[PDB]
Amino acid sequence: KGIEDRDRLLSLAQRQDKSEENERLKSEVQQLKCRVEKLTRGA
Amino acid sequence: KGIEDRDRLLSLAQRQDKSEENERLKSEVQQLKCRVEKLTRGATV
Amino acid sequence: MDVHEHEAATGCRFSWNVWPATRAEAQKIELPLGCMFTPLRDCTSLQLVEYEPVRCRVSGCILNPFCAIDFRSKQWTCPFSLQRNAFPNHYAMHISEQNLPAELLYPTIEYILPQPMPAANAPGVSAGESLPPPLFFLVVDTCVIEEELDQLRDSLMQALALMPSDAMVGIITYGAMAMLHELGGGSENVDVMKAHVFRGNKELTSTQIQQQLGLARSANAYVPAGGPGAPAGSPLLRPAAARFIQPVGECEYKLTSILEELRRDSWPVPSDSRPMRCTGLALSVALAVLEAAWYQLPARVLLFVGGACTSGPGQVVDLSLCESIRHHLDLQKDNNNARFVKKALKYYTQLANQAVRSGHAVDIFACSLDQVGLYEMKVMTEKTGGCVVMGDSFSINVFKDSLRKFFETDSTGFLKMGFNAKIEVLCSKEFKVCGAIGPCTGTGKKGCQVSDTIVGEGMTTEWQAAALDKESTVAFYFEVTNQQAQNLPPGKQSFLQFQTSYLHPSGRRRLRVTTLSYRFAEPNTIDVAPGFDQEAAAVLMTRLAVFKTESEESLDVLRWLDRKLIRLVARFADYQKDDPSSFHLSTEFSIYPQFMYHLRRSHFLQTFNASPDETAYYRSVLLRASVMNALVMIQPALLEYSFEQQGPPQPVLLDAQALKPNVILLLDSFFHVVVWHGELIHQWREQGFHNMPEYENLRQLLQAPLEDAKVILDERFPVPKYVQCNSGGSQARFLLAKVNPSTNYAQTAGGGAAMAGLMGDSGAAGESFINTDDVSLKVFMDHLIKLAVQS
Amino acid sequence: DLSLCESIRHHLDLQKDNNNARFVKKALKYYTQLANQAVRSGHAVDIFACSLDQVGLYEMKVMTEKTGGCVVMGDSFSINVFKDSLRKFFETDSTGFLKMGFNAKIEVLCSKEFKVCGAIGPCTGTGKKGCQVSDTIVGEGMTTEWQAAALDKESTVA
Amino acid sequence: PGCTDSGAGRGDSRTMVGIVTYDSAVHFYALGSASGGGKRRPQVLVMPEIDDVFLPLSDDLFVNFAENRDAVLEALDTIPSLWRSNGCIDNCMGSAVKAALLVMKHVGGKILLFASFPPTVGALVTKRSGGLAGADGAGTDGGSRQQPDREVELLKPASEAYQQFAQQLTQSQVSVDLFIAPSSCASPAAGNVPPTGTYAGGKPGSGAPGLVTAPYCDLATILPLAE
């Protein structure tokens, strides 16, 4: 029973380890911080 | 022995879990798209 | 004595102007003797000459207006060792009381030294030609996202406009590889660019790089100036070195196209892996080319890095995203996440070492939201005198104005930066030099003026600093070596002298000689008490704290801090024994205990809530800032705007009581200029009281910070984060991090539990509570007075 | 060179084979010429190079192993190596005579099983080739006896 | 070959084309189009590691000729105009063919190699003992023309390096087509070598200019790359 509980928690931890979404969210912070200054510089 | 190996695999996956940082990185990008749509409202002015 | 006027006149500030006479008293003070010196400070009475400077010849004591005033035979002894030298014949035959030479009336004298014959190391320099203008070696990262390189390209294309057109320039773009781009050549190959490639994961020595690129000095290169027929060849650089280093105005077009084609690392980066980054190799190629081509010449290596180094030498992390980087608890507690920092440490200290011996400055413009490796990177700038500009992006204003002020010119169109500075100090027999904390390296020049005690870079009277500017301040530490007070006569004034043989960008050698006088005290101890400044002494023990954190634990630096604070307060205060109510401190001592109060909570000694790279930016700017710059970063300064007060803003202490809802608070912590709007003001402008003409006074007060914030963004290098925020907004966290809470949990749960219950109209004004475990301010003087009186 | 203008030789210059080999190699062959006539005659050469700057031990070194001498390298003359190295070089033994040998010849007499090849140290091979010398020379070889212009109480030969 | 000559109008010359030039360093030409669809100008990458040869890490050094028809042809026009004042005398062709092998580990093909002199630096360098390179005539001191039993050693390869590297080409299915072209235009490397030592004398010249023969390219050593 402890093995099964550790296995389902392993599946939850692997699903919540969204390392691809960390680098993904590190992408559009870089686009959005660049779009926001070309609007001020273009004025 | 499977309990000890799965406990090591869980607790390694808990250091390598980046869920709290993922939640906060969704937070300021929400206020960044709110800010960039704020300056498009100022662009139409 | 006006310490503000003294720094305005000679560019220096001493912790003592009345000095301890004996070494028994010098340790009884418990504060070491120190002085902050800015060798390029804009003096209000700075004067320039060119001729041969008249020193003590056998010793080197420049003729201060403090020497012998011998008239009957026109000699002068020296201020030190007193050995009777004579005027030359032209230097004496127009002497009188009214006709007395220039440097013998004023202390701060520039000597633009007349140029000697060319010293057999730059072949082709004619007798009378200026030394070649300084170099900028741009080493740019390409492993970041495309828009980030677009802003970095735009800032770089601005940068190529801002340096003078005569300056040298070279470029290296690094990704997985190291691409040294070709700039020279004839006019026949303008349309095609070239790039020599170096393997990132291989160790390249300075010998190997020069042999691969042909920059190695040939052992049989003796055809000395013997070819008549070479058409208009530049003699400062041989054609081997000319293929990478060219004037800005000559390769302006091809540099424009190179930055135009600057595309990312074309490697398919795995989704679970970092980009391939040879930052350590790219700096090795830049320093090896500059050593062979540009030895003992003004160079600066502008490294624009946007992440961590993952390739070859200088590596800091592995490739996988599963293993994170170190943080401060990983440094203290022994983790696998930093298994590569060591090989990056000796690598970055050794490439700092040929940069010192060849006189090349290093700049590191680190720019990423993610960390970069700045903890390892800091040693490359601190030895060579360079600056660190760490920002969250290559595009935020912290980078854009810092880069353009790095090419900001003086009133005559040249850079406000010296190069290859030669700072040697001469002192009395009553006090000797311990060492120097700052952007300079001890060269081990032995002499009779060095003490035993080592404080930082010492064991020399002379320091090399490859980069100095108008704000480079270096601490000098002193020790009085007099054993008995009977050896000092009354009226005996001791002296010290600094001289800086630096390179102005015009191409000629300068010599800034600044000399002062100081008087020891009487055998009575208390005579030094009026002559103390609290701002200048606070800077030196901040620098001592940041130097002692490099070797000892930062916790032990805290223990050394408050044990010196207890010993100093207990000795300099007038009080009765076992009576805290009789405590009193003088004007010179009344704010210094508050200086050390926020010292222990700044990021220089506290590693909490900050990455080691964020703190790496903090120590690097701490080790080169001036006294006015240091009090800003050690204590944030809060200014206030309201209708109730007419004229200048007043300083308000950092508490939650300062957040009363109808103010504008200007927070200034050297890294965040925060213009914060109050809660009631945000209530006014929500419906627009300032917009409609009924309450235009609110609009006038709203634009009042838009002049003091602009003038302090203009004066500050590096430029801070300018954040304009309101009350309750997301951008107000910068102010709330520095604002202390006025009410603690001890003051609430310590008494008064029944006489609060039944009166009054459903709350009042909505007080904002800040939770922290820090001891409040007022309790600290209660503990310090009790400990000092008991001791 | 004559003036305080160009750079004297360093370990950096030797590694990256700089232009500064014109006074490395030319002075090396000149001092080797002087060392060859010194070892041919039988006289030892002493160096007391005591300069605060670069003086050139890497070329003046060849004088002292081919003959056998002293290489005392203080910093300035008031600095205390130069006193006590000098007076210990002149002080005598228990019998009152100065403890230095002159014009020594160190012969090796091996068996019919092993043979001698090298004498790396403060000696120089002279000759007398025979069956007592084998190939694969490391150091001074093709010889059975080695000279010694001078040899002290502390000299050892490999 | 590889162009579909069975006539239905569709863009499918599958042929793989790359360009490599060599001197004391090793020079490659990136010829792929940009990822944004623009007509990218070529980038030449100098590679100075002639001892440990590596690929300068780019993915456009070996591109399809049909999809990069423009990029290849103009790159052929710019190569003569680019190496104009290249005063380098040495060459490292042995390292150049090793670098050629690195390009087509995954493809194979042919190497249209144009060499003028034997390699003097870099890998696969061969030196010949006994001074037999002067048999065609480059020295005037009585020591190499009286032994006709050793001229058969001039006809075999001097070293076993080139057949071992040719075996590495065989396992990767890569052929080499050599084009050896000695120069007769008065190469200055035969008399511009830094000297020391001893002679002089006499009597200048007048007539019959040179009878320029082909310099010794040691063609027997370089045979195993094609044979």
Side-chain angles (χ1 to χ4, degrees):
Chain A
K1 194 174 182 182
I3 282 172
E4 186 176 1
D5 288 332
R6 281 149 182 82
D7 282 328
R8 56 102 179 170
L9 277 161
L10 265 168
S11 188
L12 287 174
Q14 282 183 348
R15 283 172 184 187
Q16 286 184 357
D17 199 3
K18 319 157 190 174
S19 51
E20 286 194 329
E21 208 182 12
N22 296 115
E23 267 189 347
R24 265 289 321 281
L25 286 152
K26 285 205 59 48
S27 182
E28 69 269 13
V29 55
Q30 286 162 349
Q31 285 87 20
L32 282 179
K33 79 196 184 170
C34 283
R35 302 289 94 80
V36 73
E37 72 205 290
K38 298 199 289 320
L39 264 293
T40 77
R41 258 196 161 190
Chain B
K1 274 302 159 272
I3 293 170
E4 186 176 1
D5 292 332
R6 280 160 181 84
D7 272 325
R8 226 173 199 169
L9 279 166
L10 291 174
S11 181
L12 281 169
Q14 278 187 349
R15 273 92 71 190
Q16 286 190 356
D17 205 4
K18 300 198 175 183
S19 45
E20 269 201 331
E21 293 83 4
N22 220 24
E23 281 213 335
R24 75 170 74 111
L25 271 295
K26 296 183 290 294
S27 189
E28 292 84 4
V29 299
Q30 184 171 1
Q31 79 185 3
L32 284 171
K33 65 182 181 293
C34 282
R35 250 188 310 281
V36 76
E37 294 294 328
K38 181 249 160 187
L39 279 71
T40 58
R41 294 154 192 152
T44 58
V45 171
Chain C
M1 185 179 288
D2 204 351
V3 287
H4 291 99
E5 191 180 356
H6 195 255
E7 186 177 18
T10 48
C12 62
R13 218 159 187 175
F14 278 65
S15 62
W16 300 111
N17 59 8
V18 190
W19 290 16
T22 73
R23 81 292 184 276
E25 184 45 62
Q27 60 98 25
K28 175 61 162 185
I29 298 298
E30 311 277 334
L31 297 195
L33 189 56
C35 80
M36 300 325 89
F37 179 52
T38 307
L40 294 174
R41 183 69 266 171
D42 190 13
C43 296
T44 52
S45 54
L46 183 62
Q47 193 285 337
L48 73 165
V49 298
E50 92 295 346
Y51 44 83
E52 205 273 335
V54 183
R55 55 180 66 246
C56 204
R57 43 189 176 88
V58 71
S59 302
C61 305
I62 309 282
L63 181 74
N64 60 7
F66 283 171
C67 296
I69 302 92
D70 183 24
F71 282 10
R72 76 277 190 189
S73 47
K74 301 103 178 168
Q75 269 78 24
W76 62 272
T77 43
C78 286
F80 311 107
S81 84
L82 278 297
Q83 185 292 169
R84 195 81 277 171
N85 317 285
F87 291 164
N89 52 2
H90 189 281
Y91 211 72
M93 51 165 288
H94 294 290
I95 211 71
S96 74
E97 212 279 337
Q98 326 299 132
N99 296 115
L100 184 63
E103 80 266 30
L104 185 61
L105 270 75
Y106 292 166
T108 314
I109 294 288
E110 286 287 330
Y111 306 89
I112 191 66
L113 183 63
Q115 62 84 30
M117 293 180 183
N121 279 344
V125 177
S126 291
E129 267 188 359
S130 66
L131 184 63
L135 197 147
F136 299 104
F137 209 97
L138 302 174
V139 184
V140 63
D141 178 39
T142 195
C143 284
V144 298
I145 194 66
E146 322 315 309
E147 63 260 19
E148 183 66 26
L149 294 174
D150 291 331
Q151 300 304 312
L152 176 48
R153 163 196 322 161
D154 291 331
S155 63
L156 274 165
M157 293 177 70
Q158 291 142 21
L160 273 296
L162 276 296
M163 73 290 291
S165 73
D166 81 1
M168 295 298 103
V169 59
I171 183 167
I172 282 180
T173 73
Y174 64 93
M177 291 294 104
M179 279 172 214
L180 168 58
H181 285 267
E182 204 289 326
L183 277 296
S187 75
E188 316 164 352
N189 290 319
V190 191
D191 47 324
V192 177
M193 51 66 58
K194 310 169 54 48
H196 297 246
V197 188
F198 290 84
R199 198 144 44 84
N201 61 357
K202 205 257 185 180
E203 297 295 331
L204 276 297
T205 73
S206 68
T207 290
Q208 282 169 326
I209 289 165
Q210 290 162 14
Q211 288 264 62
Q212 285 144 24
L213 295 163
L215 281 293
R217 292 174 155 164
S218 195
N220 277 11
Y222 285 164
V223 181
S234 195
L236 302 157
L237 284 153
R238 74 211 50 71
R243 300 174 311 166
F244 309 119
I245 299 165
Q246 279 286 317
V248 169
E250 271 305 271
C251 67
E252 164 57 49
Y253 180 76
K254 184 162 61 153
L255 273 166
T256 292
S257 47
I258 278 175
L259 301 193
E260 198 273 331
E261 51 76 20
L262 189 54
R263 294 280 51 61
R264 71 176 299 174
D265 189 359
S266 305
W267 268 106
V269 181
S271 55
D272 67 339
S273 297
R274 214 61 41 71
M276 267 314 315
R277 196 84 61 96
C278 48
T279 315
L281 186 90
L283 288 160
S284 181
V285 178
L287 283 181
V289 175
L290 282 194
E291 185 293 310
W294 189 257
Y295 181 106
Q296 278 262 356
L297 293 175
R300 300 192 81 115
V301 182
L302 278 82
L303 171 76
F304 307 93
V305 58
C309 181
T310 66
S311 189
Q315 75 287 20
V316 300
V317 288
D318 62 353
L319 277 296
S320 179
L321 275 160
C322 292
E323 299 195 8
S324 71
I325 201 162
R326 73 209 182 281
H327 65 279
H328 264 300
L329 268 180
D330 304 347
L331 309 199
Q332 292 170 359
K333 280 208 73 69
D334 199 358
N335 267 332
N336 275 311
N337 289 334
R339 49 181 182 175
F340 305 126
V341 55
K342 281 73 63 178
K343 275 83 181 173
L345 278 177
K346 183 175 174 66
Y347 192 66
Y348 291 165
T349 59
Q350 63 84 30
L351 61 84
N353 285 332
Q354 69 274 16
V356 171
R357 77 184 85 265
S358 67
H360 306 153
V362 173
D363 263 359
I364 293 161
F365 295 86
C367 293
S368 177
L369 293 170
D370 190 359
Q371 81 286 326
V372 288
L374 198 52
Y375 181 45
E376 300 81 53
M377 282 325 317
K378 74 162 41 63
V379 72
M380 185 177 177
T381 61
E382 67 185 2
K383 315 302 310 313
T384 71
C387 74
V388 177
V389 181
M390 194 304 298
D392 286 333
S393 177
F394 280 104
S395 78
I396 308 171
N397 190 359
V398 298
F399 181 75
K400 207 163 303 308
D401 284 337
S402 288
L403 188 58
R404 92 156 178 155
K405 292 189 291 292
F406 181 75
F407 300 111
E408 204 290 310
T409 46
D410 56 13
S411 61
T412 63
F414 323 120
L415 295 174
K416 291 182 182 292
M417 283 73 73
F419 308 92
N420 165 37
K422 186 185 292 292
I423 309 166
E424 69 274 16
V425 54
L426 269 72
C427 302
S428 289
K429 64 183 181 293
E430 301 57 27
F431 64 95
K432 299 292 180 68
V433 285
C434 297
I437 290 294
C440 60
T441 56
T443 78
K445 178 184 175 180
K446 321 292 183 191
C448 65
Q449 300 170 329
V450 65
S451 67
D452 62 357
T453 301
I454 298 171
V455 179
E457 304 278 333
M459 295 298 103
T460 183
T461 56
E462 191 284 343
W463 285 258
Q464 282 313 90
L468 285 197
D469 62 359
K470 301 317 179 185
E471 301 86 19
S472 284
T473 313
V474 54
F476 279 86
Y477 288 87
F478 292 163
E479 182 65 26
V480 183
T481 51
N482 194 10
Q483 294 183 6
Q484 293 172 351
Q486 293 176 4
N487 293 341
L488 279 168
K492 174 76 173 176
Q493 295 180 318
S494 287
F495 312 103
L496 73 164
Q497 185 173 90
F498 296 111
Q499 52 261 21
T500 313
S501 179
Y502 64 93
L503 277 297
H504 187 273
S506 75
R508 325 191 41 72
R509 204 41 171 261
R510 305 224 166 197
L511 181 56
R512 162 90 69 83
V513 172
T514 306
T515 308
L516 307 177
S517 184
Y518 284 117
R519 173 61 270 201
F520 290 111
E522 291 187 0
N524 205 347
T525 303
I526 320 170
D527 298 338
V528 296
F532 175 72
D533 61 357
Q534 61 187 358
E535 54 264 14
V539 176
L540 61 83
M541 60 186 73
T542 302
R543 293 208 168 194
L544 280 195
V546 76
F547 180 71
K548 281 184 163 24
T549 47
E550 292 189 351
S551 56
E552 317 175 25
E553 294 188 353
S554 310
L555 285 191
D556 195 19
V557 179
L558 288 166
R559 189 184 281 184
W560 181 65
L561 176 81
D562 75 316
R563 78 150 65 93
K564 286 280 190 200
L565 176 54
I566 278 159
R567 282 179 191 164
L568 187 79
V569 163
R571 199 260 170 270
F572 284 171
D574 305 312
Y575 60 92
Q576 296 174 355
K577 198 171 182 177
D578 294 320
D579 196 20
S581 63
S582 63
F583 188 91
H584 186 57
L585 277 172
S586 73
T587 308
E588 301 94 8
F589 304 145
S590 51
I591 298 94
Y592 165 77
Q594 196 174 0
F595 289 165
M596 296 299 103
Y597 168 81
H598 292 121
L599 181 137
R600 73 199 67 148
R601 288 150 195 217
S602 63
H603 289 93
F604 318 125
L605 296 201
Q606 277 186 354
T607 56
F608 187 70
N609 266 349
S611 66
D613 284 4
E614 182 67 277
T615 62
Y617 181 75
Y618 288 144
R619 338 280 182 87
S620 53
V621 65
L622 183 63
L623 191 138
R624 58 172 288 152
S626 84
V627 290
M628 283 73 74
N629 290 318
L631 277 296
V632 172
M633 64 184 73
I634 209 73
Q635 313 204 280
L638 199 56
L639 304 181
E640 198 275 335
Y641 297 132
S642 76
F643 294 115
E644 304 167 356
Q645 297 136 358
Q646 280 177 346
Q650 76 290 358
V652 187
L653 188 153
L654 286 172
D655 291 331
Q657 199 266 333
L659 308 168
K660 55 93 170 183
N662 55 297
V663 306
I664 292 187
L665 290 186
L666 179 62
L667 172 82
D668 198 67
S669 67
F670 201 75
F671 314 102
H672 294 88
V673 169
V674 177
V675 177
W676 170 83
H677 263 287
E679 181 61 42
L680 199 63
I681 278 172
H682 192 242
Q683 287 324 106
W684 300 338
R685 76 175 155 170
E686 183 69 32
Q687 58 264 12
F689 286 172
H690 72 304
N691 284 342
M692 66 182 179
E694 194 82 12
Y695 310 95
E696 278 167 351
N697 47 284
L698 171 61
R699 177 177 280 177
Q700 187 263 334
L701 188 147
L702 188 152
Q703 61 92 31
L706 303 187
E707 293 168 358
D708 286 349
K710 296 306 166 61
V711 69
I712 191 166
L713 285 170
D714 279 29
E715 281 185 0
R716 175 151 271 150
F717 154 70
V719 60
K721 303 180 59 57
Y722 175 68
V723 177
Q724 191 169 13
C725 64
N726 54 8
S727 178
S730 62
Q731 295 290 329
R733 58 182 181 177
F734 295 109
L735 176 69
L736 288 174
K738 305 294 181 183
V739 160
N740 298 320
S742 64
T743 56
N744 281 358
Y745 200 59
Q747 271 186 353
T748 309
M755 184 278 288
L758 271 158
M759 60 96 66
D761 194 359
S762 62
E767 295 176 355
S768 54
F769 268 51
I770 300 174
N771 270 355
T772 192
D773 292 336
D774 285 336
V775 190
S776 72
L777 169 67
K778 185 184 173 183
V779 174
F780 173 59
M781 291 56 68
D782 294 345
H783 207 250
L784 182 61
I785 285 165
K786 187 181 174 181
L787 282 174
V789 163
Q790 278 172 355
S791 61
Chain D
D1 278 293
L2 60 88
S3 186
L4 284 168
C5 285
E6 59 97 22
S7 82
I8 205 165
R9 53 168 188 171
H10 308 304
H11 269 299
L12 270 175
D13 295 353
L14 292 165
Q15 287 181 356
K16 62 188 188 294
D17 55 36
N18 267 1
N19 202 12
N20 200 349
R22 80 290 184 275
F23 287 171
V24 166
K25 180 67 174 66
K26 170 242 176 178
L28 194 48
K29 62 101 179 176
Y30 176 72
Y31 280 82
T32 296
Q33 182 62 257
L34 265 67
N36 278 320
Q37 62 85 29
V39 72
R40 176 63 37 76
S41 197
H43 310 291
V45 178
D46 273 348
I47 314 296
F48 290 86
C50 195
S51 174
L52 60 88
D53 287 331
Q54 287 308 104
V55 55
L57 273 296
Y58 187 78
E59 293 142 10
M60 291 185 284
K61 164 202 70 53
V62 67
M63 295 299 291
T64 61
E65 41 264 29
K66 325 283 214 212
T67 68
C70 295
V71 69
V72 188
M73 192 205 158
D75 197 0
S76 288
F77 281 30
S78 69
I79 302 299
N80 63 6
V81 185
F82 160 77
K83 313 332 181 313
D84 49 23
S85 287
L86 190 149
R87 66 184 183 272
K88 208 184 275 183
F89 182 75
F90 288 163
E91 61 86 20
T92 62
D93 72 339
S94 57
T95 65
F97 293 106
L98 185 143
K99 63 183 181 293
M100 281 195 107
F102 303 100
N103 297 113
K105 284 302 296 190
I106 309 165
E107 177 277 347
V108 64
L109 183 62
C110 308
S111 291
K112 300 302 276 295
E113 285 84 31
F114 75 109
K115 270 82 72 175
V116 65
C117 84
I120 303 172
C123 295
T124 301
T126 57
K128 204 173 312 166
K129 288 94 171 192
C131 65
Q132 280 260 288
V133 185
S134 302
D135 63 358
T136 62
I137 290 311
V138 297
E140 289 89 9
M142 294 298 102
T143 182
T144 314
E145 301 62 23
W146 300 258
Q147 74 90 51
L151 81 173
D152 269 352
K153 285 293 177 199
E154 63 266 4
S155 62
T156 66
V157 188
Chain E
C3 296
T4 47
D5 286 331
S6 63
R10 258 181 179 218
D12 217 2
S13 177
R14 335 189 311 266
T15 71
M16 292 304 337
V17 162
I19 303 177
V20 169
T21 53
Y22 76 92
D23 58 351
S24 56
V26 176
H27 292 171
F28 299 152
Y29 283 78
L31 299 174
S33 295
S35 291
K39 271 186 187 181
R40 194 179 178 195
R41 281 195 179 206
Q43 177 171 20
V44 65
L45 308 175
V46 188
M47 191 304 297
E49 281 316 92
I50 63 172
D51 291 331
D52 189 358
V53 61
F54 67 95
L55 196 64
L57 282 184
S58 185
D59 282 7
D60 288 337
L61 294 174
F62 203 58
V63 299
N64 188 276
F65 181 63
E67 318 272 27
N68 296 268
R69 164 91 61 61
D70 183 307
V72 172
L73 291 189
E74 60 85 19
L76 286 167
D77 313 318
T78 310
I79 278 161
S81 67
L82 183 58
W83 315 114
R84 284 306 184 195
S85 59
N86 197 18
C88 171
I89 310 298
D90 285 17
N91 56 357
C92 64
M93 172 265 308
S95 304
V97 192
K98 293 182 183 293
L101 183 63
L102 283 191
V103 172
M104 63 183 72
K105 303 193 44 56
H106 49 301
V107 175
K110 314 152 71 53
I111 305 299
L112 275 81
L113 170 73
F114 309 97
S116 49
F117 283 162
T120 56
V121 287
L124 290 182
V125 61
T126 58
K127 65 179 73 174
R128 292 204 155 194
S129 307
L132 289 165
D136 293 347
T140 52
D141 278 333
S144 67
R145 228 173 167 179
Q146 281 183 6
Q147 270 187 347
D149 292 341
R150 285 195 179 182
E151 61 86 20
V152 74
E153 294 178 1
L154 275 300
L155 294 174
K156 296 183 290 294
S159 85
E160 280 53 53
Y162 274 108
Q163 52 272 60
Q164 183 66 41
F165 175 68
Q167 193 252 330
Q168 262 187 57
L169 294 158
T170 306
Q171 73 65 30
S172 192
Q173 311 283 338
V174 174
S175 71
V176 180
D177 300 298
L178 289 87
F179 294 88
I180 308 302
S183 83
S184 63
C185 281
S187 183
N192 282 140
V193 183
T196 71
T198 61
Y199 283 160
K203 289 180 152 159
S206 67
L211 208 77
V212 190
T213 59
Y216 183 61
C217 286
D218 206 353
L219 183 63
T221 310
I222 207 59
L223 293 175
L225 289 192
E227 282 190 349

